[PDB]
Design a protein around this nucleic acid. Sequence first.
DNA 1: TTGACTCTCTTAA
DNA 2: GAGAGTCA
DNA 3: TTGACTCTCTTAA
DNA 4: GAGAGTCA
Lengths: 162, 162
Amino acid sequence: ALTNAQILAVIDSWEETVGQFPVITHHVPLGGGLQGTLHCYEIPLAAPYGVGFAKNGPTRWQYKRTINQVVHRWGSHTVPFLLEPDNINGKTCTASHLCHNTRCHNPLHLCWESLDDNKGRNWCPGPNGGCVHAVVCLRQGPLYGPGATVAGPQQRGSHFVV
Amino acid sequence: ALTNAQILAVIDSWEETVGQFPVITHHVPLGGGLQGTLHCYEIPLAAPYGVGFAKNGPTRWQYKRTINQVVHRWGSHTVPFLLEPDNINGKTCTASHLCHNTRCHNPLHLCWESLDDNKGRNWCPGPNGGCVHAVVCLRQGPLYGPGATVAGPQQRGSHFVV
DNA sequence: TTGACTCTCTTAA
DNA sequence: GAGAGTCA
DNA sequence: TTGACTCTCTTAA
DNA sequence: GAGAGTCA
Ligand SMILES: [Mg+2]
Ligand SMILES: [Mg+2]
Ligand SMILES: [Zn+2]
Ligand SMILES: [Zn+2]
Ligand SMILES: [Zn+2]
Ligand SMILES: [Zn+2]
């Protein structure tokens, strides 16, 4: 098994490498009609991505290090959380983008939470619009708003009551 | 089937059958510390379900009718919306439970919207807690709340800014 | 040991 | 959140 | 014609 | 949102 020291060295090598990813300034809604700025550290669109990084899907990457002749590989956004519990309330912990930018590997834009918590951030009103997430959102969710519902509740007869 | 008359006949037959399903009272959070009551018309847990209905998954059903000597079949919750556009902004329209109760087939608890709009209702603060859905929620979403995030954004070094 | 690809999988709407 | 096939 | 099962699929985190 | 294989 990797020791704590070895895990800390993986996190440090990952941070070193990600810290050299292009830093992109994004203006984002915070909720309440306010605008803010996020600084995303974006993995390149095509190879090479950076030492240890490889793309396993359109918006999926992995980080790989070989320690004492053994190859270790992690989801590319999971590395900041290698010293954390990997489940909570019986649910698997996932890397969760507070900036909603998959290419971003800025650990200040990531949290570690259930997939349900992760998904729900997509619709959050944001840190200035009423976010109640205990680990606060950095921005209004990209899908927040009135929606585009095509048809609402309706009946042709009188068989139903709400 | 093809004709508007045939489609109205399907909707009317579906409503009559669903209207005979047991009416179950559910007390629900509305947001804002308020509680309300919904009347769900719940398909039975096991066969027989009702004329035209059959279970294709743990919480999936289909409605089937023979028209023009051919079998026409639909997802059980899609029938109220057979005269509506089946897409919006290039996204497929889905039946979406405002009561978040899949066995319920009350059309006064259903709307017709993108899967994204559908999902997002799970986290809505509700009609008395700030729901902004243009087709208003009937209750606070079951996943609304602070979440259970295990670890927040963090870095070991000084490579990153928010 | 490393890069750049390949494949399939999980969840809950 | 879906569509479609196999039997009786 | 109708009922009661079976299977896999879609989406975007 | 994930894990793992192949090849040089
Ligand atoms: Mg996310
Ligand atoms: Mg729903
Ligand atoms: Zn970011
Ligand atoms: Zn939030
Ligand atoms: Zn209902
Ligand atoms: Zn709502």
